[PDB]
Design an enzyme around this catalytic site. Structure first.
Site, short mmCIF file in Angstrom:
data_model
loop_
_atom_site.label_atom_id
_atom_site.label_comp_id
_atom_site.label_asym_id
_atom_site.label_seq_id
_atom_site.Cartn_x
_atom_site.Cartn_y
_atom_site.Cartn_z
CD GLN A 19 -34.21 -52.47 -76.55
OE1 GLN A 19 -35.43 -52.31 -76.55
NE2 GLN A 19 -33.41 -51.95 -77.48
CB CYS A 25 -36.93 -51.76 -79.70
SG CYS A 25 -36.68 -50.80 -81.21
CG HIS A 159 -38.50 -47.82 -78.05
ND1 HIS A 159 -37.45 -48.71 -78.04
CD2 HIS A 159 -39.25 -48.11 -76.96
CE1 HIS A 159 -37.55 -49.50 -76.99
NE2 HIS A 159 -38.63 -49.15 -76.31
CG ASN A 175 -40.05 -50.04 -73.05
OD1 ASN A 175 -39.64 -50.40 -74.17
ND2 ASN A 175 -39.65 -48.93 -72.46
C1 LIG Z 1 -35.44 -49.51 -81.34
C2 LIG Z 1 -34.76 -49.86 -80.05
O1 LIG Z 1 -34.92 -49.11 -79.06
O2 LIG Z 1 -34.05 -50.88 -80.02
C3 LIG Z 1 -34.53 -49.60 -82.56
O3 LIG Z 1 -33.72 -48.43 -82.55
C4 LIG Z 1 -35.35 -49.70 -83.85
O4 LIG Z 1 -35.44 -50.78 -84.42
N1 LIG Z 1 -35.93 -48.58 -84.32
C5 LIG Z 1 -36.54 -48.65 -85.64
C6 LIG Z 1 -35.62 -48.03 -86.70
O5 LIG Z 1 -34.99 -47.00 -86.46
N2 LIG Z 1 -35.59 -48.67 -87.87
C7 LIG Z 1 -34.72 -48.30 -88.98
C8 LIG Z 1 -33.26 -48.60 -88.70
C9 LIG Z 1 -32.34 -48.13 -89.82
C10 LIG Z 1 -30.88 -48.51 -89.66
C11 LIG Z 1 -30.05 -48.24 -90.91
C12 LIG Z 1 -28.78 -49.09 -91.01
C13 LIG Z 1 -28.02 -48.92 -92.32
C14 LIG Z 1 -27.51 -47.51 -92.53
N3 LIG Z 1 -26.74 -47.31 -93.77
C15 LIG Z 1 -37.96 -48.18 -85.90
C16 LIG Z 1 -39.07 -49.14 -85.45
C17 LIG Z 1 -39.07 -48.38 -84.12
C18 LIG Z 1 -38.57 -47.17 -84.92
#
Ligand SMILES: *[C@@H](C(=O)O)[C@H](O)C(=O)N[C@H](C(=O)NCCCCCCCCN)C1CCC1
Length: 212
Positions: A19, A25, A159, A175
């Site tokens: 990625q 992810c 993640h 992964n």
């Molecule tokens: C995982 C990766 O390693 O790419 C990636 O960080 C991810 O999608 N993690 C995910 C997550 O954190 N989801 C919420 C994101 C919120 C962002 C907010 C943006 C606006 C702020 N005002 C989750 C699924 C895996 C844990």
């Protein structure tokens, strides 16, 4: 369900992807489950577009992260294109689905595995690859080079990955950190510890696509 499941041996798993720096992810995780379920139902193994989900899932936040369940919903509502039609660029851009012609595949819905339940997750994995989340921030996870991983890790899941198999003492995870990480891009995470969260919070939030 059997003692061992390995969807790679059933030809249901595409090569390991990287990625890159993008927090995509959630899209990679979702695509693994789509590639899996399409092969399981149609016999054809194709690669599908993480980029499309990155660009087009309005509930997620692009490279700032997002939700496997949302991405899986989008493929059930609309569909997904082949990876080579909509290749990965590692940056969120505008949604280009309509410019790339008919969708290549479409699912019929998304289901959540009962959380905090090892047996429920194993049952789902025996049926198809599953999107799962874990805590990957810890250095032990990042530096994993093989073996059955027991941590240390907390349950601050961050993640999304895909469970593509299991054994008596592990769950097999695809992964999205390229083939140089872990076991050719995979990790076996210990199961059966009695921790309801799972090792590294692995049982927190698991989803799979439904395709009739
Ligand atoms: C995982 C990766 O390693 O790419 C990636 O960080 C991810 O999608 N993690 C995910 C997550 O954190 N989801 C919420 C994101 C919120 C962002 C907010 C943006 C606006 C702020 N005002 C989750 C699924 C895996 C844990």
């Amino acid at each position: 369900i059997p003692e061992y499941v390995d969807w790679r041996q059933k030809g249901a798993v595409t090569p390991v992807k990287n990625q890159g720096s993008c927090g995509s992810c959630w899209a990679f995780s979702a695509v693994v489950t789509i590639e899996g379920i399409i092969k399981i139902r149609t016999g054809n193994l194709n690669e599908y577009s993480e980029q499309e989900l990155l660009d087009c899932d309005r509930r997620s936040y692009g490279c700032n992260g997002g939700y496997p369940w949302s991405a899986l919903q989008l493929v059930a509502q609309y569909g997904i294109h082949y990876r080579n039609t909509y290749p990965y660029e590692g940056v969120q851009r505008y949604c280009r689905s309509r410019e790339k012609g008919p969708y290549a595949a479409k699912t019929d819905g998304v289901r959540q595995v009962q959380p905090y339940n090892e047996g429920a997750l194993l049952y789902s994995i025996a049926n198809q690859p599953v999107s799962v989340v874990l805590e990957a921030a810890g250095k032990d996870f990042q530096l994993y080079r093989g073996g059955i991983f027991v941590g240390p890790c907390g349950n601050k899941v961050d993640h999304a990955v895909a469970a593509v198999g299991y054994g008596p003492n592990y769950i097999l995870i695809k992964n999205s950190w390229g083939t140089g990480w872990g076991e050719n891009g995979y990790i076996r995470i210990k199961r059966g510890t009695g921790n309801s969260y799972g090792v590294c919070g692995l049982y927190t939030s698991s989803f799979y696509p439904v395709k009739n």
